[PDB]
Amino acid sequence: MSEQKKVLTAEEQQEYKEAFQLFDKDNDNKLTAEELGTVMRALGANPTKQKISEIVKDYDKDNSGKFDQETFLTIMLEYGQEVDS
Ligand SMILES: [Ca+2]
Ligand SMILES: [Ca+2]
């Protein structure tokens, strides 16, 4: 295959699986605000810990201050692609 899709495809699933897995040696199956900020930076540019921490505490208040793969997979799946570039 000449073309490739790193979004809403198997490539995205594996990419994120290893991304969170490698950044989760504690084996918690989740990532804290700080951890999420590191992986999120790859999707955006380079935000501040205080900024990301505020979004995590506001986006994750009905659960906790951690991130679950299911949440990221659901959001990326509902968006259809999220990023265009
Ligand atoms: Ca962890
Ligand atoms: Ca949550």
Side-chain angles (χ1 to χ4, degrees), residues 46-64:
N46 209 61
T48 354
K49 276 236 175 90
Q50 189 154 10
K51 314 300 223 214
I52 181 62
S53 68
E54 195 177 286
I55 301 296
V56 178
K57 71 174 65 178
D58 208 276
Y59 195 69
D60 308 66
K61 63 195 161 187
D62 82 83
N63 264 102
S64 220

Side-chain angles (χ1 to χ4, degrees), residues 8-84:
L8 230 306
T9 12
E11 267 164 300
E12 170 138 87
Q13 197 210 250
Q14 59 194 259
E15 275 263 76
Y16 179 45
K17 279 244 285 256
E18 72 179 285
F20 99 89
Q21 169 182 22
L22 169 118
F23 265 110
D24 193 67
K25 253 143 283 250
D26 49 39
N27 211 341
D28 293 33
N29 222 53
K30 300 179 84 206
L31 281 305
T32 78
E34 298 166 284
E35 295 250 26
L36 170 75
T38 299
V39 58
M40 200 125 143
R41 278 151 111 178
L43 250 69
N46 209 61
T48 354
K49 276 236 175 90
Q50 189 154 10
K51 314 300 223 214
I52 181 62
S53 68
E54 195 177 286
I55 301 296
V56 178
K57 71 174 65 178
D58 208 276
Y59 195 69
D60 308 66
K61 63 195 161 187
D62 82 83
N63 264 102
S64 220
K66 270 90 188 308
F67 249 65
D68 172 40
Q69 276 40 248
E70 204 98 344
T71 300
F72 229 130
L73 249 141
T74 300
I75 300 153
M76 74 180 202
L77 181 79
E78 203 110 280
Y79 244 118
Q81 230 162 297
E82 243 223 64
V83 56
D84 263 87

